[PDB]
Amino acid sequence: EGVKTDFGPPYFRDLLHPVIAKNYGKWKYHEVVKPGVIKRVAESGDVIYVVRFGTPRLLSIYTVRELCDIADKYSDGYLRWTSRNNVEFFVTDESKIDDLINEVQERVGFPCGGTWDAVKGEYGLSNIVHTQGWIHCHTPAIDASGIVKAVMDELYEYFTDHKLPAMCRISLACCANMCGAVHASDIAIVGIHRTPPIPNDEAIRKTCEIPSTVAACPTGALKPDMKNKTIKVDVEKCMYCGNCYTMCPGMPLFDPENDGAAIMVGGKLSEARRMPELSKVVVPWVPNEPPRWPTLVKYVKQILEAWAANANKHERLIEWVDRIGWERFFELTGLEFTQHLIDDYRITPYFYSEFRASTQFKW
Amino acid sequence: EGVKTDFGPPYFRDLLHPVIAKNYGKWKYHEVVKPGVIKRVAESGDVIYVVRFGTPRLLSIYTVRELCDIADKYSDGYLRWTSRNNVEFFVTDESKIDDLINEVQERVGFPCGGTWDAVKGEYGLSNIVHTQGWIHCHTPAIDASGIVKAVMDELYEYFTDHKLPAMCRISLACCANMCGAVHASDIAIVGIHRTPPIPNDEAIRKTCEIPSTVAACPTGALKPDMKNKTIKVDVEKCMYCGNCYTMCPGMPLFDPENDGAAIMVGGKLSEARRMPELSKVVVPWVPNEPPRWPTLVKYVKQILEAWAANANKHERLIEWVDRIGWERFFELTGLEFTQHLIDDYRITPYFYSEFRASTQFKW
Amino acid sequence: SETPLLDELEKGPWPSFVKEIKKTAELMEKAAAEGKDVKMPKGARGLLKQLEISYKDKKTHWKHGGIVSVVGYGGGVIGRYSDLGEQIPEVEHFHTMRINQPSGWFYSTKALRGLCDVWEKWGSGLTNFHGSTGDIIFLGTRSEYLQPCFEDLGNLEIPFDIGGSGSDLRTPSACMGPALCEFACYDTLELCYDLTMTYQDELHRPMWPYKFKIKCAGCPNDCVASKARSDFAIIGTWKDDIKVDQEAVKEYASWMDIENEVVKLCPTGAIKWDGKELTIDNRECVRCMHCINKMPKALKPGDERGATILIGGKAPFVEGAVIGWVAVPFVEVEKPYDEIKEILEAIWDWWDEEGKFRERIGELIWRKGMREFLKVIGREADVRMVKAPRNNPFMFFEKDELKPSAYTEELKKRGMW
Amino acid sequence: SETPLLDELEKGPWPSFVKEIKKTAELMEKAAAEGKDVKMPKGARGLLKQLEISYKDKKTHWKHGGIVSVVGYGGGVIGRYSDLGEQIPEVEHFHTMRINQPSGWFYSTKALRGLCDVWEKWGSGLTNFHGSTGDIIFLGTRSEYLQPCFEDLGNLEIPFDIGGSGSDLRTPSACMGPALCEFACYDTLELCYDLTMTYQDELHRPMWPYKFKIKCAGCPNDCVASKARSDFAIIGTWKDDIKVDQEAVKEYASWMDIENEVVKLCPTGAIKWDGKELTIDNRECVRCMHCINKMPKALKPGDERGATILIGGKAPFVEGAVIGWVAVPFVEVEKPYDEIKEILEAIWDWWDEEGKFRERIGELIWRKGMREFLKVIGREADVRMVKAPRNNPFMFFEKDELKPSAYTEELKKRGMW
Ligand code: SRM
Ligand code: SRM
Ligand code: SRM
Ligand code: SRM
Ligand code: SF4
Ligand code: SF4
Ligand code: SF4
Ligand code: SF4
Ligand code: SF4
Ligand code: SF4
Ligand code: SF4
Ligand code: SF4
Ligand SMILES: O=N[O-]
């Protein structure tokens, strides 16, 4: 026989609740009933309630088994995750919705919420997309799971209710690889280094292919040292991206006292009302202070609170700034502008600013 | 004894018409009378009438002498030129306004006009800022004063009256050096090449300074010859900028048949209503056709006539596009979008797009 | 406590990942003590212990990874070794396996339980639902268990294959699309499944200069973040008029401030409401979704549907962060998706041929120019591709666009043509 | 017909340059035969015939220029040789002398006549009024006439000195400002003359890596295109409230559509009119001039005046076309302008010491970054310098901003600090 390979993921259509399978592509409209609860009405007349819960993303298999029992009891043995790692159950009997929410809350400690309603114009904060950090990654400047936990404990009320005037996405990347959506988020936490690499000549020789390590440096900071068959760093040109360490174990630059997070704001992915946008740095650096990261959490909430207090309905962070300007933004958020925030990343081509980075155009 | 040096231009202040001198930096308001005549009222109650004429820029000293004969007759032996190379007269007694207007036509044949009123919102096309072309410059792709005389014949009308809904600057440069306002005009005519230089190995060794020729190339198409002591040109990397030819006489790229103009559009210098903007290529190439350059003149008129026909009062060319988009611009002006118009000029830094190229900001 | 820093993060209202780790350790040790067949009962607790040392030192305790895979694949498992392997031998090896998810993360309890049963036997018991690219993450097992784990996965009643890693096609992912969403402009789940199965070899066996990610969004709201998080973003759109139910708008009009919340917020002024009738100048609409989002009982995407393809989206390294830009204004999305497959295969052949080591497609297009890219995919330059035409006159011309001349004859005579 | 192509450009409503050229040689050759001290009577006709041939050939007939100036000065004379320099012997040399213009191009007739007699004696009679940089262009002369001509300009009752060329301080220019204009936020003309005098050495004797230009605009309308055509654009501005005459507005609003033409066109919604009163919110004013442009009988620039400095304006070679960006948000403009001069000299010391060959200042700042530029001019970073904060986290940090650590001690131990 030989082992089976190249068979792919099980076909989703066979994993769909029968009411979803039946009404596939034949929905009339959705209606956000309450935070965490969305009613979907098919053209057939079928009505399905999709109930959403926040999760820590890292799950115990025993938790998954618990969610399985719950799904068997309330949603006919079917569920899904969302693209922000919330978990959803499908309920046909509206009189059972609350029994479900209470049973999840009680059995696995997951809160109902993470929804928003553009119709009324009232929005929850959903989950934070984040990476592995110290749990599994070899190149992190910050932890991912500890910071998300700390930030969500503080902004918890925003997840369970629809308290914000517009959509706000928060994301975290534990280094400048930015593994997720930090580069296009309303608020983004990004791990950075502040110290250059110290070439370890013996490790570079044994394990590093020099030309491709050299070419990974965005600034030209690295050059080969032919005589000693190694690499030299020009510290004047190094901005601590860590990319040379991804390539080469003989190029570490970690420093637990100077590694930290930058805070970026004003990314947007959707097209609604205004074109997508890359997030922008507004706090250069905050230290790692496990387990609660209070300086970092304090700035994230400061930024979110100032935005929520002055935003009009639908006006996401970048839109708010389109209205008021960066001058008033730094004033209202209590943030200091410094030279760090003046862009100096030279390699990027200006012509990219003239490409249409969006699906908005006229036919 | 030795020649007097380092004495500079004569003091503007003694070269000022008495009425202008006394009332210096103490004006109440201006008020365009009619096209080509601007009324200026001092705070002291005094009234001076500023009257503007087109000049060819190039001027016989005899025309300069004859402009001085008119000047003693109508403006007390006092006159200025404007930043666009028009000539202005300083009339006191306002009956005399018309006689001068007549005499100038009678002598040098210079039309009254080149004005606009923001208040009314009726604007005239003013003179065309241009360069030297075949009259004196040794790296032109097109001729300046000819094309300039050709455009201004077909458009002449717009100069003498106020037939436009917003301000419109036309500018010309005869190579990529781009002298004048050409990178920031509502309509621009920029001489280009389309042909790579064939190096003249004999002239390079004798005249050119190799390393700085190679270093002058914006795309790196140039590489020195080790042998040989010359420069080779990678045809695949050359975009015919003509810069190498500036630094080195042995690098001609002239091809009488494949030299021409690009027409660019949508530039802006002033801050009013919307931020400053660089010009954008909208027609890649039109031939040189001494003596009238009919095809250049056609597209210019046709780009202008279609903006005029559509633009709201004060809506300049770039502001019009803010409104309709580029899809609609190309349709309405009857133009073709080709790959030539997608930017691929690699070296310019994306970060310039994030700098504030404008005085528009809040305190 | 053995973990006084992580114990802090069992406090507070948000569900705690530390409780997830502790529950796994407790129950895996309890299953192994009940004689169940569990190979790594101490895996979870050793992760716990190393995390606590990481919180105290404020640094990673993982080292640079050696290479590891399943028999027959060169991607899908990320080797990981602890620099604390002698102090904590139970995490000397702690590789992740990425498991390809069903399109839109739809499961049945039977499917998930099969995964839990296999992972309990072979691994730490820890998972991510889900990895950012979409995959189920099996977090932490040993080199010897990778193959036998994969064999169990493939033998389940509802079997699961490994996902992508390395310089391959990564696991494609999709928004829920037509399964739940009345805005879907094409079958996102079906297109994702079909691309996944069509390109199994490209996924399982990395061969390319670097990675390539595809993401499927049913409409411009882009709920999978395709334009930022995939090189090839397939974004549902339409070509005809938005569908309007006038009675339903009036229903909204009775309570919603349509003027301030819809009319004034349209990027292009395309939509008007005069108290009795709503109008959409569809020639002026850029299909941003805002009005539909606002009035889903009243407004729908038009009938002539397909997608816009945005190319090049990537994180910063090396040449900077990319939100993908218009490559293909409109393509049809119908099974078996030949036009989309044609575009893909053309790009991947070109890119495999010209790409440098670790160059993403975005960077290659920056390097080669849009003219070469458009020739590769056999499409013509369109104004929708740019936000503005070039701000300089340094244009390349094709030799065949030039008028024949003495100078062009001179270039030919020299072999510069 | 001597010129069957240039001839057909003496036709039409717009005043012909060909008729300007034809007129000159006609009157210079008539002069010479009248015993008048003319040294290049065949000036314009040499030029006329060469121009007719270029129209035929559709190519220039000028070749590269051999270095030729005046004694003591390095710049101000652009050389030029005709490649038909024996067929048309009188265009063997046709050198231009750039002549410094009075600030704001103001003249009395005396001044211009004296200019005319010199050029008719030593030149072709052909001029340019004016050059883009600002100078008067004397057009076409020979090597051994430059020096006598400049002796004569320099012995005129109303004298003119040479302008700048090559790698130096170019001739500064300034809009009419306080001479005729009611928006002028400072005395543009005085500033320009003063600057031109102060730095005569820097203008006449090129020592710099490339050229440096200065233009002075009296208000944000920027009537000298300063931001686009000088490296250092001094643009007039104000800090307090726009002065508003309330009765004056009422007058305007009897006939003028103030709502569409002013209110709805202000870029930040800062200006309000209710039929009764005009209100401006100055915290929200960006000082674009539009509202003042529209109603100069009502609206004035406020009292607290000076200027904004925009750095780096330039044509595209080598790194792209620049409209200057905010370098100094506000600077006072009063004689002898020592605040401006401190800036100018700090930039030049730095630019001379750091710049490459043919590197414009704008390009050095792009190379060295804004932190070094700001340190040089002793100014702090300010949000107003940027349109947006950086779109990536790749920031440099000063070594002194770092927390002391075992790692920093390691860097010091090695000599990497
Ligand atoms: C379930 C989920 C799709 C999936 O396949 O899993 C989803 C589902 C919906 N999205 Fe989404 N979106 C989902 C992630 C996204 C993301 C992707 C992301 O955040 O990484 C965004 C793009 C983010 C961005 O713009 O930066 C996203 C941007 C939107 C937009 C735009 C909001 C805006 O004002 O800009 C709409 C419109 C709306 O608000 O009604 C939207 C609207 C919707 C609607 C209302 C569509 C519909 O007609 O049913 C769905 C219900 C959302 C709600 O709670 O009201 N969906 N949606 C996603 C779950 C996330 C979660 O658990 O929190
Ligand atoms: C005559 C001249 C000044 C000088 O010689 O030093 C001048 C003079 C005035 N300009 Fe100008 N501008 C002059 C060059 C410019 C040019 C600069 C250039 O093209 O080189 C433009 C910038 C072009 C651009 O922005 O691309 C210029 C941008 C303006 C603005 C902007 C208009 C807008 O709506 O965007 C104002 C507004 C207005 O009053 O219309 C203006 C208005 C004015 C005012 C009305 C100021 C005043 O309070 O008196 C002056 C009367 C001119 C008029 O026709 O209304 N002037 N001003 C200029 C020479 C041009 C000519 O003779 O035709
Ligand atoms: C597991 C996952 C993070 C997470 O927990 O969510 C992840 C983790 C890693 N990513 Fe990633 N990336 C993950 C999605 C992403 C995304 C977003 C996406 O795919 O939706 C991006 C941005 C889009 C893109 O790919 O550019 C992303 C951008 C990167 C980068 C930057 C590539 C670039 O062009 O700049 C690195 C660099 C590299 O490839 O060397 C990288 C490489 C890595 C490595 C392989 C580097 C490493 O070994 O240290 C990661 C493994 C850590 C570990 O041991 O688990 N990962 N990574 C995400 C994938 C799991 C899955 O199968 O679903
Ligand atoms: C004289 C003038 C022609 C005209 O009538 O417009 C001129 C013509 C020449 N320019 Fe210029 N530039 C003239 C103003 C400009 C301007 C506009 C301005 O000064 O306001 C620009 C754009 C602003 C700028 O400087 O970037 C301009 C950008 C250039 C370029 C490109 C500069 C760059 O860094 O990209 C070259 C530079 C070079 O090769 O030396 C140049 C150099 C030259 C040379 C010396 C080219 C050469 O190799 O001979 C020109 C000599 C032609 C001649 O014999 O008269 N000229 N040049 C212009 C000034 C008249 C005057 O002296 O008052
Ligand atoms: S963001 Fe960095 S640290 Fe986090 S998983 Fe990705 S690569 Fe590892
Ligand atoms: S850390 Fe980044 S900048 Fe510094 S040397 Fe390595 S790759 Fe280059
Ligand atoms: S643009 Fe070129 S050709 Fe025209 S004057 Fe300037 S340098 Fe000479
Ligand atoms: S013409 Fe321009 S691109 Fe071509 S070689 Fe010369 S400088 Fe380089
Ligand atoms: S992208 Fe469009 S189709 Fe997909 S879930 Fe979001 S709204 Fe629905
Ligand atoms: S979809 Fe967007 S652009 Fe189109 S009408 Fe609705 S709001 Fe306007
Ligand atoms: S810039 Fe201002 S002050 Fe100077 S002329 Fe133009 S409008 Fe008048
Ligand atoms: S000056 Fe400009 S921004 Fe300020 S209020 Fe007037 S129009 Fe508005
Ligand atoms: O696995 N990160 O693309």
Swiss-Prot record, chains A, B:
Keywords: 4Fe-4S, Heme, Iron, Iron-sulfur, Membrane, Metal-binding, Oxidoreductase. Its EC number is 1.8.1.22. Siroheme binds at residue 179. Gene3D superfamilies: 3.30.70.20, 3.30.70.3340, Sulfite Reductase Hemoprotein, domain 1. Highly thermostable. Inactive towards methylviologen below 55 degrees Celsius. Binds 2 [4Fe-4S] cluster per subunit. It catalyses: [DsrC protein]-trisulfide + NAD(+) + 3 H2O = [DsrC protein]-dithiol + sulfite + NADH + 3 H(+). One of its GO terms (biological process) is sulfate assimilation. The keyword Secreted does not apply. Catalyzes the reduction of sulfite to sulfide. This is the terminal oxidation reaction in sulfate respiration. This is Sulfite reductase, dissimilatory-type subunit beta. The lineage of its organism: Archaea, Methanobacteriati, Methanobacteriota, Archaeoglobi, Archaeoglobales. The gene is dsrB.
From Swiss-Prot, chains C, D:
It catalyses: [DsrC protein]-trisulfide + NAD(+) + 3 H2O = [DsrC protein]-dithiol + sulfite + NADH + 3 H(+). Transmembrane segments: none annotated. Highly thermostable. Inactive towards methylviologen below 55 degrees Celsius. The keyword Thylakoid does not apply. [4Fe-4S] cluster 2 binds at residues 266, 285, 288, 291. One of its GO terms (biological process) is sulfate assimilation. Binds 2 [4Fe-4S] clusters per subunit. Binds 1 siroheme per subunit. It comes from the Archaea. Keywords: 4Fe-4S, Heme, Iron, Iron-sulfur, Membrane, Metal-binding, Oxidoreductase. Its main location: membrane. It holds the Pfam family NIR_SIR. The keyword Iron applies. Its EC number is 1.8.1.22. Catalyzes the reduction of sulfite to sulfide. This is the terminal oxidation reaction in sulfate respiration. Heterotetramer of two alpha and two beta subunits. This is Sulfite reductase, dissimilatory-type subunit alpha. The lineage of its organism: Archaea, Methanobacteriati, Methanobacteriota, Archaeoglobi, Archaeoglobales.
